[PDB]
Swiss-Prot record, chains A, B, C, D, E, F:
Organism: Pseudomonas sp. (strain KKS102)
GO molecular function, one term: ferrous iron binding
Enzyme type, top EC level: oxidoreductase
SUPFAM superfamilies xref list: Glyoxalase/Bleomycin resistance protein/Dihydroxybiphenyl dioxygenase
Lineage: Bacteria, Pseudomonadati, Pseudomonadota
InterPro entries: DiOHbiphenyl_dOase (IPR017626), Glyas_Bleomycin-R_OHBP_Dase (IPR029068), Glyas_Fos-R_dOase_dom (IPR004360), VOC (IPR037523), Xdiol_ring_cleave_dOase_1/2 (IPR000486)
PROSITE patterns in UniProt: EXTRADIOL_DIOXYGENAS (PS00082), VOC (PS51819)
Subunit-level organization: Homooctamer.
Highest taxon, organism lineage: Bacteria
Domain VOC, residue spans: 4-118, 142-264
Keywords (A to Z) from UniProt: Aromatic hydrocarbons catabolism, Dioxygenase, Iron, Metal-binding, Oxidoreductase, Repeat
Protein name per UniProt: Biphenyl-2,3-diol 1,2-dioxygenase
Length: 288, 288, 288, 288, 288, 288
């Protein structure tokens, strides 16, 4: 099964705005380019987020990591057994992503996924944030998470769990209207409470938002002010019911896609019990 | 197998007395109602104890928790293989218990059991005790425990261990008379030394008592005084031989059913060794 | 010198509103009454805040604590040497405040101060909050702090430091207007970064606000929502430059008097270095 | 497999001398009698060492513990498969040993072994040493260990490992003469470095000695003086090469059987590596 | 007495080279300007190092910090008693240095010293390094240290100890030639092993070098490479005999003035014993 | 599979030079001889490195350890299944190596390997270094590591992983020339990041170097100076990208074979993720 989320690639209409957003506001480290994609770092990996020009204004692909070559072949085997179409990346692609091997596929609703192993690290160019943030929590929990919009949760669920090996952490009934809610399913593939959540939201984007976890509460506090000066805040500070992440949300330059910048969540294991929650926030997160 | 005891439902003749008892004396948080049952909280769960009017004056049902949907199906499979009759709860029942799924059955002697998954949590309504108690120890150890009265221990043992997957912790020969004792069997399904004990007591109740574990010794000390002012004490403070729980006992408003309020026991694991004890108390617990 | 701030008494136009405010919103424990004052608890002390009817809608007095009888006499001596008028409380007053001895005086601008020793504690009636808050940080740091409005800071400074023995922690230039700021002086008399701050604010109240410190960040988060539902929020969450308290502000029912509810500040000692800051917030605290 | 050594029974010519030896010198707690055997305690177990009159002046039996009934049946199965004769203890024997079940057998050279489960504990009669010793290290590591004399190590090895499930920790070539040594094999069945060692010593006793482990170095130091006043010392203080136990040896009242009283050894696990040592002592243990 | 070294001001011929040096190589944060001085930050202080154009190519002044106003007056008193000339800084100077008060003087050999209190902090503009360094160790130990060149050590010693209140930590005989050494005197005024060292070196600069202490060994390792790429290394990594600082040295753009970038030294207290060392390095520090 | 690297044997032209090198410079303890091999100790093992005269000036053999006899037979079985030729060491060889059993084979390119169990320990002759080093990190991680030169990495990889059970940790592309690099494969068989690395280097030696890990950074610092006085340094201090070992390199007396003396690396487990690095050093290690 997938070990963790390692990278995200976006295709956007305003690359300079995304560049400023990811460096001056979020704190990521600019790390040159690959092909027509600008690269950004959060840690020792050569890159974690990629931004390229495109009319999509959306997540273009997501990289799903394994630990070694054999594990990648085993994932190939699973995709074959499941009837999911995939192609092995060629040399050019491998060089572009800076990986030792990869399989290209899509989830049931068109999101390109790239399962890989052997990512590049550059400890000789130590991470340097572009804005005041002490660092991010990644490591074995990967880069962070994202919330995937789907038309059919059950269908999405079967694919992510049965095929990719993710596991349901919990469910929240997200209130949409007076008498309307969406059952969001939070899935883990490691100690991070969730790496991918699935929800049938009525938005025209592949994802509702992506999430990065910073080292300290102050990291989060300072970032809020940075995004507020930029006029991008969508929620006040808050804390979630299910994962206990303390965060705020903000708009990216791509309409309808947000970012969540948080701290201090609960982690999980095999002993995690599926439960249901009626609210996303234990406190805070009022919309603005 | 069952992961933990999650809830208890009582059917009683004096609902107001039980309400006062569970809030002002024990410290539970009143949490509205469901159907004709009043609900009480000990933690983040939407409810842990339910009280409804009834001539029984006894435990009406007990909820046995699993971690996810698949585990529930696996329990279904075990019940089928064992020939134990059961029915899947309907929507109405699921809504009443605030669970995502359940199987209704009885143990060999008529106690209704409800095996479930996906309980409701409401972290947005943080627990607030009705009396001075810093909190209860629950989490993965569930709500607490109870001691089940049975006519045939061996028979009860086979069901709880072979069918529900509980495990014998130890046995105590409880002195009844000058030359009379009952071999009580203490069973675990997690780190709590026991969640259910089985004993052939000569009382006309399904259970001898239920037990809640508080965070501090002072929690226990203060509760004793609360129950003493209420005239409900049945034992002085004491400490058990087998689990090292430090507690006292008191009567509930249902005749012959007691509650045990304790602190600081030993926990268990796979390395737990079955042993036999000749007394329930290492010290204290004198009857009053 | 004064060891800590032990209690506050307010005189207000809407006692029921203050009662609801201090219990349902802040979380204090109602603790009966003394004279025409309603009493509220935050810990083991018999009372910490007192509310009585009055047209003032302001702080009526503040109790400044010492450790023993001799220390109280020594404070008497200091007041004599300094020419500050004072009167020893009579039996009736002592009984009302539940103290073993006290001296009544005023600061240079009319705020009644009561220096006392031997406060009453009632550990047999353990603290029980009226709203979800795990507890407050008091002990040797006293009940909390307040910010005192003064017409003459230098004059106020000389009295609090030279006479009462407080010590300057630091100064912040609080921006009032485009080119206008007030140099607020933060003073300590123990490990709490400040117990009293002095500032020449243009408001018609003795104090700008009082501050209570809760045990956890969640305590603060939950309280914000409680005060927001009440429509009382004046600032978003934030963190101070000087003390690192993480808090929010809200209106009390007395116009122009706020409360600050915070967590996790820096403490001080003899090695504290006076410094100057140009902003009150390191992050957050935007006015609303 | 066997989980730990739980008890030892000796048959001796001088019961009063053994009584004084185990209480006044070693520090064990006298715990009445069972049949014609006097019982001694080291902890919460009803008994750990038994002494009965007999011309043997030797170890009469050793009790090998399991964790539950099923494990005992599984050991029965193993003995059957291996062709080792055994008999299930009758009620009388079970009552005498205070166990819930047992199998009686002998090792290849005549030492009676008793495999059991469900030992009696009496926490209501807390352990009280007869001499100054803070306590013994037992628990999951059992009572201690012993060194078994055998004519054929290989043969003894096959039985203890293949049949009883013990595991080789290491081997020491114990120098007997100028050019003569005995390869002693140290075996574990839990965290205790060894519970049984096997050695082809030329003595006319089933065991060379038994070993108890005390809580502190001072416990050991004080015991030495106690045994020296009794004239029983056979070795000076020392520390072993293989287990790092710091101890001294002394004669019991049964000729050629010694006791080892030690402290602070290394524990083991699955990652333990078999090694060979040329001396028993890293330092000390000179014979006297 | 002086509490710590708070800031340094240099007057140099190549301001752009110093700017690049302090940001890209050392890792300091550029923090605008004051007068014709460019400012650099290492922590929460508004500034720690100042660089202005000048033919000196040397340390122009050093700021010596106290904790409050009274302490500053007490230092004034000491200077008066000692006959050392000084002037109180005017408003303009105070504004330039961002301090609440200061006294301007020189040491016996012309180095301008500025004793101050009430420095400015700007926690609302959190420190952001210009190069990969996790942070510096400052706080109560001040910015770091420097080694002061003097023609007369005894004379310099009397001034720094008797007048400014520094204390001798230890002495090292620094080998100059085959049979030539300089007795360097290392002085502390807080927990930092030394803040100022005095030595009769034959160089035409006020100081031999200044020293900054980074949080980690990696910080130091990475900086070495940064300075080596710049061609500025003067010593290999090493560790000092007296303070145990692990560091390397490099040239600044001002000829004959170096910088020392280190980690992990010993701290001191009242119990520090004066000792003498014959070498500066316990290991490493070979000149290059 | 192999548990760890236990010993190394070299065949050299200058035995006295190797003796001085391993004792006075590295710090190993001379431990007599076996056959025509001089023995050296790093810990409690009777020997860890052996040096014998020979024209090879290279690694003559390497000992690969298991935990017990059965494991050795299991390795025999694996070699048989794989078609790798091997011979069981005779008594003489066993006595020479001081082991209880061994299998002699070669890797695909001629390096003799000796898989063994039951090594000799001599705790009665506690380790005493010949030079100032507090000790080495060995234990379950074995003696250290080495980098093996191979003509065919893929071929070498298949043997070490599939046959001996080593596991790939990571890969580094070691820059050889302007546009030339060698993909070195770092393999583990325990917690040590690597025990054997494989690389297609163009040198006429079986190994590029062997590595020992000391207890402290000072151990490493002092050793550097020792080797520098001997004129043997090949690299400055540095820290690796993949294992985070902080070390320096030096020449042994055998041309083209170096030694690496390091400290403080990362350890591994099952959760280790294969990654790729473009440099060997995160910092330092400049060649000299
Ligand atoms: O981390 C998280 C935890 C719980 C809920 C959300 C969520 C909130 C709004 C929309 C979608 C998800 C989230 O990001
Ligand atoms: O927790 C417990 C541990 C040991 C015994 C009891 C017990 C005592 C009296 C009647 C039944 C059981 C108990 O609750
Ligand atoms: O705790 C505090 C720390 C720093 C500033 C304030 C403050 C803010 C606004 C008005 C007055 C004081 C405060 O309460
Ligand atoms: O614990 C131990 C560890 C190592 C050796 C012995 C030993 C010494 C002499 C005779 C037999 C065994 C022992 O008891
Ligand atoms: O921190 C330090 C500790 C000991 C010596 C020096 C030193 C070395 C060379 C010249 C002057 C001083 C130093 O900076
Ligand atoms: O421990 C290590 C970690 C990473 C690389 C090397 C290495 C460097 C040069 C040549 C071969 C290997 C090494 O020893």
């Amino acid at each position: 099964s997938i070990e963790r989320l390692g990278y995200l690639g976006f295709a956007v209409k305003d690359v300079p705005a995304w560049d400023h957003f990811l460096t001056k506001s979020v704190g990521l480290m600019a790390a040159g380019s690959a092909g027509d994609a600008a690269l950004y770092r959060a840690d020792q990996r050569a890159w974690r987020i990629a931004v390229q020009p495109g009319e999509l204004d959306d997540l273009a692909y997501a990289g799903l990591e394994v630990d070694d070559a054999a594990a990648l072949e085993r994932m190939a085997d699973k995709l074959r057994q499941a009837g999911v179409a995939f192609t092995r990346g060629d040399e050019a692609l491998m060089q572009q992503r800076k990986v030792m091997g990869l399989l290209c596929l899509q989830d049931p609703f068109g999101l390109p996924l790239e399962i890989y192993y052997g990512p590049a690290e550059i400890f000789h160019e130590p991470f340097l944030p572009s804005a005041p943030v002490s660092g991010f929590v990644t490591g074995d929990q990967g880069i962070g998470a994202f919330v995937r919009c789907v038309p059919d949760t059950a269908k999405a669920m079967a694919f992510y769990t049965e095929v990719l090996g993710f596991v349901l952490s919990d469910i929240i009934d997200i209130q949409m209207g007076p008498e309307t809610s969406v059952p969001a399913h939070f899935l883990h593939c490691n100690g991070r409470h969730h790496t991918i959540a699935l929800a049938a939201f009525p938005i025209p984007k592949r994802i509702h938002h992506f999430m990065l976890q910073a080292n300290t509460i102050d990291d989060v506090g300072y970032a809020f002010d940075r995004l507020d000066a930029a006029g991008r805040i969508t929620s006040l500070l808050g804390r979630h019911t299910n994962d206990q992440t303390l965060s705020f949300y903000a708009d990216t330059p791509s309409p309808m896609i947000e970012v969540e910048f948080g701290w201090g969540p609960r982690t999980v294991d095999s002993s995690w019990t599926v439960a249901r929650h009626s609210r996303t926030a234990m406190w805070g997160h009022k919309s603005v």
